[PDB]
Amino acid sequence: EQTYFISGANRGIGFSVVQRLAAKSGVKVIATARDPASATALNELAKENPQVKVVQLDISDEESIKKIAKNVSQYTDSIDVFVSNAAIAKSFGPLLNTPREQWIEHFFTNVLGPIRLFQELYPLIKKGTQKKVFFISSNAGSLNLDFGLDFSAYGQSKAALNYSTKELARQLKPENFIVAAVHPGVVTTKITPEESAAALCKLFESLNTTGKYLSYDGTELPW
């Protein structure tokens, strides 16, 4: 049996990934929401597929993050595949027009959030078999891609986490960890939440090497 963990599983790609793992026999899924009582679709998913456990997590909330380890410890002694999915994307366009609170929010939510989450759940990942670690990044977070758009605090935060993902990959190679930054696609060319999920589950299962920055099709991105 493998244990998957997905932050931000109440909707978007997160929900779709959990929805697909529920169909994989012998998969336990720690799925998170910041408000699990209001996660209608997810709570349904989990009553009909109770291998799905719904845990509370606000990745912007250090007090929430300080509890994620015991919350997950209620359901599992290990994580095989960790997916930092939960993130925000609220601020684009010019620097001169990006106010303080926007820079702050994307940092706390999109960088510190995942770094703390990972720090907390490292012990449970370390006791698992697969030792696979996925940060859902964005192609917008590359220092070497030009989309003809400014991504403001969004892009900066994905670039910051990518930097730290690269380092983590280096640092955990001796422990046989597989660490990746993954662009899941752009979802509603735009691709469906279900299409992104399908590709992410394949990539999650297929990835055998660490320190990669991958798009959902499994092709590499420049850092």
Is residue 10 close enough to count as binding ligand NDP by CB under 6 A? yes
Distance (Å, rounded) from C-alpha 197 to C-alpha 42? 15
Identify whether 158 is a catalytic site residue: yes
Q: Could you say which of 28, 53, 158, 212 is catalytic?
A: 158
Which of 9, 21, 86, 112: binder of a second copy (CB under 8 A)?
A: 112
**Do the Cβ atoms of 182 and 136 come closer than 8 Å?**
yes
- DSSP letter (8 states) at residue 136: E
- DSSP letter (8 states) at residue 140: G
**β pairing state of 2-6 and 212-215:** unpaired
C-beta closer to ligand NDP: residue 128 or 184: 184
Question: Of 160-219, which residues contact ligand NDP (CB under 6 A)?
Answer: 183-184, 186-187
Taking the CA atoms of 179, 183, 185 and 188 in sequence, report the sign of the dihedral they define: positive
Is residue 75 close enough to count as binding a second copy by CB under 8 A? no
**Do the Cβ atoms of 191 and 202 come closer than 8 Å?**
no
Which of 76, 85, 98, 210: binder of ligand NDP (CB under 6 A)?
A: 85
Distance (Å, rounded) from C-alpha 128 to C-alpha 151? 36
Is residue 159 close enough to count as binding a second copy by CB under 8 A? yes
Is residue 156 close enough to count as binding a second copy by CB under 8 A? yes
In the list a second copy, ligand NDP, none, the entry touching 203 (Cβ below 5 to 8 angstroms by class) is none
Q: How many residues bind ligand NDP (CB under 6 A)?
A: 24
Q: Is 8 annotated as a binding residue?
A: yes
Q: Is 11 annotated as a binding residue?
A: yes
Cβ–Cβ contacts within 10 Å for residue 154, how many? 24
Q: Which of 51, 60, 58, 53 is nearest to 27 (CA)?
A: 51
Q: How many residues bind a second copy (CB under 8 A)?
A: 38
- Which residues would be at the binding site for ligand NDP (CB under 6 A)? 8, 10-14, 34-35, 57-60, 85-89, 109, 136, 138, 183-184, 186-187
